[PDB]
Amino acid sequence: EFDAIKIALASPDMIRSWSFGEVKKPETINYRTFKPERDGLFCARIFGPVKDYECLCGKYKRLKHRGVICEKCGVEVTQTKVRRERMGHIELASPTAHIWFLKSL
DNA sequence: ACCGCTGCAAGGAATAGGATACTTGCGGGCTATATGGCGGCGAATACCC
Ligand SMILES: [Zn+2]
Structure with missing residues (x-):
């Protein structure tokens, strides 16, 4: 099918285009009930069903x-393979510098 | 038709016994300062013109 691999830089707009949601909470798992958190690093409403x-x-x-979503969870009822292909995006309060383009020598 | 009496409660000294306020160690639940390896190489200073 495809024939070539292209590589370039990613503008912030394009990064938003990739993402399927925003991460905001540093919490992952309850350690008592093994469901994910509200919208933590893991999540169901962002990445997908479990x-x-x-x-x-x-x-x-x-x-x-x-296809339909829940009215309380908002998750997309579909395969769990989506949980390996969706990406989130964090919002950074301050601009920051990519380390690779700084100390590459 | 008035009174001193008996009698029937209220407050002191000696024993047994449960209730109940108090004390304590935990178990799980949560959050957040090195010192024996070289070799190559390329960039970044140093230098003395
Ligand atoms: Zn639901």
Whole structure:
């Protein structure tokens, strides 16, 4: 299919284009109930469902409801492979300098 | 038709016994200062003109 690999820099707008949400909380797992956090580093509303065609809260749990989202979780009921291909984006309060383009010698 | 009496409670000294306020160690729940390796090489100073 494809024939060439292109590589370049990524403007902030394009980075927003890639992302499917924003991370805001440094918390990951409860250690008691192994569901993810609200919108922490892991998440369901940002990255995707945890089980194949399973909304997080369990309002819909069948493949018949593919595509629709939950009205309390907002997750996209679909395969869990999406959890390996969606990317988040953090917002940085201050501008910062890429280290590679600074001490590359 | 008036009174001193008996009698029936209220407050002191000696024992047993549960209730209950008090004290304590934990278990899980949470948050946040090195000193024996070379070799190559290229960039970045130093230098003395
Ligand atoms: Zn839900």
